[model samples]
Target: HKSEVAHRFKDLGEENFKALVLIAFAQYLQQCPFEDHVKLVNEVTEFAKTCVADESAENCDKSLHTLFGDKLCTVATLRETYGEMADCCAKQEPERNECFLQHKDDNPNLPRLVRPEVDVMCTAFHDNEETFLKKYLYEIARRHPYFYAPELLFFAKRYKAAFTECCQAADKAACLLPKLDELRDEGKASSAKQRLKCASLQKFGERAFKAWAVARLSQRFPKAEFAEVSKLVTDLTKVHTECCHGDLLECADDRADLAKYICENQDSISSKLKECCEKPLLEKSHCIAEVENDEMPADLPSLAADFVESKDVCKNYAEAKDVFLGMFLYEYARRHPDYSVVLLLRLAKTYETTLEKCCAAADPHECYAKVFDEFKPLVEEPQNLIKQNCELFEQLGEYKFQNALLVRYTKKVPQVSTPTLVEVSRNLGKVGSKCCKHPEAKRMPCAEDYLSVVLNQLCVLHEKTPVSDRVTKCCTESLVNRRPCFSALEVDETYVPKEFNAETFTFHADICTLSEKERQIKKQTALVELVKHKPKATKEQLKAVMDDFAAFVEKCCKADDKETCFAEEGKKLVAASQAAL
Candidate 1:
């Protein structure tokens, strides 16, 4: 969203315009009190990553922006368009101020996408973000032998100064083209993601973009000790690999052993850390020794997994992910129980509806435990209960619950003449609704008994004839409803008092709406949407298209030939709005 709030903010949906905004919140979370860190980070990651559409992005924008406004809304765009510039600008304020000034000096008269507040923000809001992100990028790069893709450390830092120099120029890309030509010649720009990284530096801009990030960040984490703190993380990460990598097979099972190993090797790691402020090495190592022997705190695992698994169950399942990730991260069962919770909750979100709704909570795993603590297994197949059980059916929100009750209903109910098909129609819903009132876990037995009672009565009613029965099955054209009258009792399949038939009945409209006149409105809509996605079409701009089309539809299509009349008219209206950008 950084590009959205651009100075004049010409968001013609192209990211050609860049703005000064926050870089990342997880970068800020790194500065939060440790207790608040993990939960919030996981919440944002889970929230941001799972979204399939702009809705989730919008939600993330609100959460992230309200607290940290400068966070770019289109992070994917940020990643795709400006990964390098975004990464490098996260340096300390003095460095950013230095670079932005370099950018200014290089192209001193360069105009901005927006202005007026440049000085206002310059004095008030300018921040340097590096105290944490720089450390973050470096620590992650060194965390293990297994590699992560090259990001901030390798290229961003290298290109940052140059990119800002380019941003100060009116022709930003033109200014950087020569440097890229230099880097591209040096075997540096060999790949696509790499090449894009090079382009992104100038695409987003050198100084303005970088200045925005640093100023925003510097203001946030004032007096940050990233330089001193980073050494502690680097030293500890190296020590963990050294001390913990000895026996992948024997030592992998217990992370406590590795923590203890850190205890023994504390002085080893500590002795090398004289440069770390706050005696970081001693504090880190000694703290580990204490925590290693200390009793595990209850609720620390966060998820309530103990009730279900035994040794080698969820524990072994955790190592089930790739060795590079799980071994370095999850190396032990008890040591990483929260992962089991993370793992299982993800599964539960897929399997259980309660959890899906619960996931919207800040701590979804905890919410799942509180809402449904019972061990819900793989649900059996779906069928209606002996009675329709529609009440319970309505309350059954998730797939498992619907299927759980669905399995009971399909297996034990009668179809023809039982309850005269009249009573079955009425009471199926009666029993379904009745069944819903019980504990959902208890519904299985309740449903089985209810089925037996209804089916027996159904069995006894087998010889019953129904020519005089009150059931009413409507003939097709009659259902076109041209209106009707009800009798002593009315019955329909799947409808209480439904019109009973051997085959099922389904319809698009009561019958009148199925006609072409109704459908023309729909066909015309599809044309509107297709054009709306065309170039330069924004959501707000497209709404006018829809509104205009609706009016066109009323005038041209109020009474039409086949769909061709409306289609022809729609094509003409859309031609004018075609791909604005």
Candidate 2:
């Protein structure tokens, strides 16, 4: 279906509009095999218009029942997609549409969509090409309507092209097989791009990132009104915020639904962006990103928002700080796409700080009046060292990256305990694991976020402890200056990690007498102590030592002389570990 009819129904309100479209498509799926595809689309459009315009339950039911009057669609056939519309059919007008929408095919037990074997697929194609194509289209749409109509159509088109190519070849299966891998690779790239976008959102706070979303959407759909584009960005931000936290597969699925919604209304937005609908399902976002922004709309909201205009900026901010700050960031960011996001973030931080200082003054208005001037003087700050660190993290892989951090942090703060240093290095390495794989556009910001988190932990951990002057200086610096200061410092090579002491690695009857949980905790403590002393020991060697200790515990804990057994075996385990080191 073209979805133009459904887009028109959107004026009824979001939920109602979604329901009506779903009902229309459900009816279309039911009638597709018997009726011509174009005819079914047209018929559904008329039925939907009649149902939406009239308020009475009678008229809506009459339109709906009339649409299915001649069809042989049974409850069995409707179970998967239409989901038994009888209860909805019996309900009143508005509630009827709402009820129908609630009947989504959300059953997790429903079988996944799998490709047919080569022989069966080719046979179906040979028997009746049009019929086979329609079935292919129907199966996908009914099973995964999260994909918009255009996306499913694109998939079908690709399927036909691949089949046509392969069927003509002598080695049909082989030719067709490789095309599946090609399709898989395309999907993989698309998913990877989305993952990076989610990382960008997490790294950049919601308000600042929303500003980026606004810029991208408005630029892509240049003709859309500022209000309209802003609403779309709201939905985009809502989905990303809720979905990106966990269950990433669900995030991608919801995102696809949003894409479908965008595509349905693309023509009303921009002629240029509407062209994205023609690209393959997953390639559309990339296409939209590549499209250049047009001239700014005359009705675009001014950068001097309510926070700026209020007589009491403090009171305005106190009323709704998140909302006020979000507005400020959104306004400034959409207007200035030339500024890097890192710089944009710094501006946001400055605005917050201005609020903190100015709001406390006796004459707050005068203190806050020239905030924009303050922003103007602030320029792009350099992060050359951070970029270099991120580059090295990506190139070195996780193990070697951890080693690098271990060396850097250990020398930088030799006063900290070895175990604490090891923990800090592992955390920094985790930053690499999480952020290093992000796409180019988002990699730096993500890395910057987690790197700061690890360093801040260090500052907090050593707040009560003795540490070097350079460490203290970096910790005392402002958040904006601290990372650079830390990165620029020299490593201290005067200190060395202490060697393992067998005397300290003692055992007693308590080792065998403790509860299961306590015993496990004790075992972990011993392993960490060994790691703390032998900081340079290889992971494999450490694991081997731990394994031997576990084996000794098994035999020793069961002996009649448990205390004596543990004492002797523990000593041997410690000696072996030290020897390996």
Candidate 3:
């Protein structure tokens, strides 16, 4: 209850003062077990109601004084309340229930009294000083490490890193050196020799390291260091400005060493400091044992063993262990044929939880893919045991299969085939056809290819177009060029009256109509034409032309008259468009 009040105060930006009041209330409640929570609630309600009634300007000043007493509230006081609440909650079973029941009465009163103080502290702190606020937050985090929690360790680490960066940027070492030296000198008189010696050594070492880095950079680039670190931060910057920009170097092939030096030094310095401050909890083990080797487990699934052995599979598996677990559940169902669907379902749910945890630790997509890949064998099998199960099939029917297939197909794209600009353009045309209700709607796969083609074309057009008139004409031409393609295909199927005709039609509506040979020929011909001229038309322009050709094919497929389909109107339009260039 005190933690809840403190949390509310934290959100209000007056955590310190409210935390103190919450602690005091919690302590009072702990000592008096028989107090009525309803009475506490009524008391708080009455106090708030009174404040609302006396909302005149005359009472505002007095209310403010009554809200926060003279001495400034500290985060330490708030954290003390948090500690007490945690202790009470963690008490043994019977004791925990007793503690909570006794304190329940004060819970309502606690939040109400804490709220106003939190508001005041927040306003005062935010208005006066931001640096002190950050320092105070760091102090609170340090004092209550348990409150930070394992889940929030990364955020705390990030804050610490940012604080360090800020300090470095401000040359905080220079400001602290004199004060630290004075403190050391003052303590030397009374302090034990051993303690004084260690303190002096630690301070001197820290100062020495700072001095070396700063002095080294300053000595090397006196002018630039004085101006800004950005001007002379590393050798790479020096090489780029003094060599590349100055035309002293032609290619960047030799600059790897310079880049490596800068990156390595920065990483090493950061790593060294981190290691010094936060040494690993575990000790390094290098002991090796020799034993008589035995054959691998014969019962282990060969496919699973193979998957673990495969570099790519292992890499993806290591990258997403939870997804692999989900996939394993699916596989386990297949192997254990006797397992009931209900049992399999329970296993899958457990696996899903594991997958979620893995996703939280790493990446969602990677975890999903890893799990999906593991399930691939199950899905790919002729039996497909999971799909055969009535309950499981109902849970994951056509939609799941389709989604899984799409993900698998997309992942395989880079490895399967070399995707060209023409393929990209053709795909775009299919997407447009689908969007505009053309006859070829069913042929379109993903819109990525089409989107990519349009993007490439626009980029090319911009590069060719002069900067002065680029915006004015480039957009107009691009729009006009795309219009004819759209017009050739855009049609509402419902509006176009369907009629039966007794003529043989070669133009097929299905995407599977074209033979692989014909498709390859068309792709090659398009590529050849684009590269025919000297300093030939760019790949993007070729893609745009191919898009227009695809649009023409769509129009031909939807033609009312089969005679004038691909043979007449389509061929004529395609040839005319190609010849015009």
Candidate 4:
């Protein structure tokens, strides 16, 4: 529904605008079987001239009918690809051509449309590369009107790569089909992950989540003011908030709007962040997140140093609690760029709580005089925990890091179901893998921003199934502080995990015969399933049990009689697990 022409070439003069309109239509015509390029040009040119002259809904509608009457280019084809131009007639005459250039009818509530089959696409591309690329652009542009031009271009580039690679292959279908499927799946995964974030937004109120975003953006752009970074967070959060409410089109538009917001507001934000906006749409978020923050100027005073001690503290808070707290947090966040979002948020919540309790006290100043000390433990506890976590994450690698998390969560909350434990472990483990690999200076903030997301998931999970007093108290904490509170928990040692049976480790010859990639997947799947069943096992204990099972697989697979060897070694694997358990 978005006007691809308008987005790709905005603010064009009348002559240039009309010229590009003809060019767009001509390219569509080229894709058809008809061979009269001159006639196509003449007909399209007439429509353009007539529409520009009259600039009325009637004139535009009637001209489209005339253009389509002869069936040179079918109405259906143009309607599907460039239907927004038809709506341009309804706008004022002065802006009609601009409307035609920028018109879109992207209703967010509609179901997604399917693309052409692999064979159909390959045939079209092989027949004419130029025409096919145009078709590809139109198809993507029209369907996802909310997408930025750069995003659409990225998709087009991928399609070109796949088409070029597969068309020349001996097994074209085999080569191209999986690539197509993979690309589609990756796109789906990206959307799903985004949806998950939005769902988190709905559960956690806007302010709390927005604070987390502030933490992230502030760390990424340390030189930027809270007011500056927060504007960016507002735009980003708006997309998630609306998108999660079932308006796909609005979500897409919001995304484009956010991209534009950053691109156009470069001067107001950190100079380092400009590079992210300058990148293509799809790549912008990643670039911003990974880019280094500007150096904080040396020997700066605390921006909010006197906030709590001010005579007007309680009075200011009583008037506009949100604005008052936001001011404090903004100043606090600017100074402590290394603080995790969860920790910063905890600090915010603690400050808010202190004001509430002390403001009502008989001697308010006396009650709140030592409030700064209350915030000390909140920052130190989580900071220490993450430091140790990143260390273990570095020592263990991905699989073992995940195994340790699984062991830790299952032991601490034994009453929680296996499925939920694995889910928690996988979510946390992913953040560890992503953040722990960064350099020391950048690692903690990186870990904290994303770690806040996983912790929110845990809080929600606890809400659904209350497992312990400690978890309940943590979950009851302010949403801003909930993750930091959860992070410092000690393991519950009262309950032991159940041991797995021999049959759990048993596998057939099919695993060995699978392709290398397939076999690794199968083995990993088995390990995960095995881990889920043995909740009582510690990370070291699970590793020992898995080692025995892996040894059995390796030695048995090489034996002359794999079946006999598997049966013999399988018992040892179960016995090893039992001993460890």
Candidate 5:
């Protein structure tokens, strides 16, 4: 059995990378005293809170009492006897892992071991060829380390991102490399040729996903043309990006440089961002609260009071983290005054996680600022909100989570109701005096006025027209499963599976906000799905057959009926499918 190693790399940065490599080489780091690891974890956790710029985050006290509890750092060993020559490595990928396993054997020997270029490496550092030393160190460690390649790649890119501060205006002007690459050059580096990768890997994963998408589309609609089909695959990726906020955009609004230029000016922004940094970087309650209005000006940051609090920020940040994520977290935090500390401490990290998978160009604030408005749902209270609230109110008796939930629901502001902390506390005392009594450290429903007032205010937006009573009923029935209902509603407001001969709700053309061509594509897509559903049900299969020819007929048909479109459309779809075969 092997002892494993891990540390929270999130805040430790490249220093952790070096330690990780050292840990891979020797158990020396982890073998140190228990207090040492705890101290380091405290350091890392503190750093993470600060990076998020928690305007007012408290410290979270974590220590290892349980064996399986969170240990910010862990594990250990491997080494080897090696090759005679300094030839290129034979251990590909994955196989470096295998070689590492072999090194774990009681007596270890390795083929393709790295040469003792350590002597040259030693001299290289003194010569100030930092770039060469950096890359050389990465290559050198990758040969021996279990996670050599990935750690090497991650650290190099991370280091490149950080080292830009050392760049000069003259070099930025003289360099032929892209601005980002230009910043990467170190210690008298002006040569662009050393910086550029012959092959770009940034788009490889996207291309692979696109390939899978097209393959799936082909199977879904065998008769659909490759020409129009590509557009569908493109939209699928676009929707995925829209939902995830991970796609790199050409422009960003949050950045001073603006959107698309967000990536281009990254070299510039990264440097400027560091200028606002403060020492101990005073971690505490809302950072903005610490820095007062107008007194905190452009080009300079003020020293704030000491970060004093008995309860750690992590202790407080937890409830908010458990409550929200992504745009939901953004909206909830932005709309809730009690969530100010959470907004400061957690939103940046949430934004980071959302965009961690973004394409190379997706810069942080700029990318998010660029797209927020486009995707932010235009919210309006539904006419049926009161009725909905009444129904929700009736069920409050059974909700075991009523008070804790009420506190969350009540504190909501603006887009929802604002229940002051003192207001909730006063009412909480009232609830206990007459009703549920003990409200804290447990669950009970006593805050009806508090719950009802806030619940009625939390309006759910629904489509105004093309409304299907049955579909809305089906959707709302599952509203107890909050996020699920919201997602389904966004796709099609009346969406719920069972069907009848009643007039089906036609998705309004305006609701989709699609171009005419895109609408036609949807029409084609509907036909394809109907055909798939009835491949065995000859009539619908017959309907599927109709879509192939139905595309042209919809233009001429006076009836804007979907089934009429599909029922007849399937006939031609079969003809086209058969003809293509």
Candidate 6:
């Protein structure tokens, strides 16, 4: 029973209720397909509103408060929840659909104010139409759009018009033609003026004609007419030159008319041109080579080669190349389908060697197709060789290999020579030092050795390799000793024992006694005898006596305590020691 009660009331807390409302609002704003949470919140809000309204009756108020206090609390909680939820939703999605849906049967007990609050919240979320329109246009035109609807056509047209206007404004602001004419007329003004003026005027007219023709042609053909497109581009370029010219203004109208005529009859003109002149060939020998390599999956290479060889392939190639390239590269990289680097190198070298042969043997288009065909296969395939080899290098502690591979792979395009071994070594050293303090200490020596090898390789490979600070520090510490210095007395050579032979012996001295009649008041004083003690000492007592004697000798030698006495004693001892020896 207790478990049932807890389970039933699990979603009733204030925070939980707030989160539910927020989730519902976010789902609606995000255009999420899940609508269960929104429906639940709506049902609860309506119930609470009804309860609050019923409490307004004077006679029912006391009983209402007693019976439905919890329900009344839900009204304020829901309002707060709605406010926060609405704010979050509005920040993320300013434009959204207005309502959940119209109710089939209105509940009389539901508060009238609740509908207005919901409407206001939704309206506030979508207040900025322009911002949403810009986003919508950008998405549809430039990025992928989820829904393709008739309404999107209007937006696309508006966006195109805006783009045209922006381009025109930029052209006018540049004043390119006037500047060009000014430069031309600096010397021989009369002749330069005529030429520059005509050129500038012609260019401006050509641009306008080109834009008008492009717009008209685009309306007629959505996919684009290539001849008309090329003519339009040429005209725009002429306009850029014309605006900066000084003397070619007279030919402006004629150029503009020519541009207009070319665009208006592009189909017929293109056909005539094709009949009169040979079609330029695009070499596709690369494709043939790719097919011949047979390293990639047969289906893909064969399909690619077939496409290149087809007459209609050129039309679709432009649209499909990016897709094909992405798919091939992703799959190749993911699956490690083949040895990519070796294949690419072989293909590149083959292209280089066969360049002239292909040009002479095939039409220009076929020739181009051949080259791109080879290029495409290799470009499309994922560089699995590099990836696998680099991983192997890392595992083998061949860090230079990994580093070189990383530089090559991460670069926009692989370069001719890899990074110097020294650079790799230094990088490895830095990495090793960072990982040294980790629990994996046993691996550290291998890492250090790997870095050292890399550095040495770099030194061998590079003529001007600079020493890294880390290597320098390591070398210095290895060469220098860091032990503390010893005291002079402790390190004296005279204290060392030496071997001796019998020939080095010295004469001995005789023992003599002095006898005098009046002799020596050679007497010991009674007061001195009282101060001296005769000892029968234990080991500890004997050690204490020796320590005391040493201390007394050190104190007697102290300069500050007995300067004259120490000096006199030292002089007398030195004289007596030399005479005796």
Best by TM-score: 4
Per-candidate local distance difference test: 0.33, 0.60, 0.34, 0.62, 0.31, 0.32
Give the worst 10-residue stretch by lDDT in candidate 5.
Answer: 192-201
Superposition error at 490 for model 4 (Å): 7.5
Tell me the tens digit of each residue's lDDT in model 4 across 1-581.
03222232233334333333333443333333223333454455555555445445333544332333333324455555456554544554435534543443443333454667777778889898856775455544444443333334555568789999998889888898888876764554443345446655777778767776766666555666667776777876776676565333345557667766766776666676667777765466546555666666567676444575667778888898876777677767767767766577778788889889999999787787788888888777766776798888889777667767766666566667666676667667778877877766566677755655566556667778787888888766655556656666776666554455556567776666787646655555555556556654566777777677777788878889778766667766666666667
- Candidate 5, residue 213: the lDDT equals 43
TM-score of each: 0.16, 0.42, 0.17, 0.63, 0.17, 0.19
**Displacement of the residue 218 alpha carbon in candidate 1, Å:** 30
Task: For candidate 5, write residues 348-423 as lDDT tens digits.
Answer: 3433343333322344333333333322221112112223433443454322123322333222211111223223
- lDDT, residue 471, model 5: 37
lDDT of 5: 0.31
Point out the higher-scoring one by lDDT: 1 or 3: 3
Lowest-scoring 10 consecutive residues by lDDT in candidate 2?
65-74
Q: Model 1: C-alpha RMSD to truth?
A: 27.7
lDDT of 6: 0.32
Q: Evaluated with lDDT, which candidate comes out highest?
A: 4
Error of 1 at 232 (Å): 13
Better of 1 and 4 by lDDT: 4
TM accuracy, model 6: 0.19
- 139-249 per-residue lDDT for model 6 (tens digits): 222221111111233333444343334334545324433332333222223223333334334644543333323332322222223444445446545654543331112
State the TM-score for model 2: 0.42
Tens-digit lDDT track of model 3 for 1-581: 12322222333234232323333332333322213322332343334344444544233333222222111122234225434444544454445434433433312322211212333433444464433333333333223222212212223234344334434445544443444344333222212222222332354443222222233333222222122322223333333333222111121222434433423443322222222222221100000001111112235464444233343554565676544443444345434333333233434544455445654665554444455354444333312322232233245453333222222222222111223333333333333433323122211111222332343344344456433232324333422123223223221222222232212112334432565546543544333333332113333554466566677666765667644566676556545544644
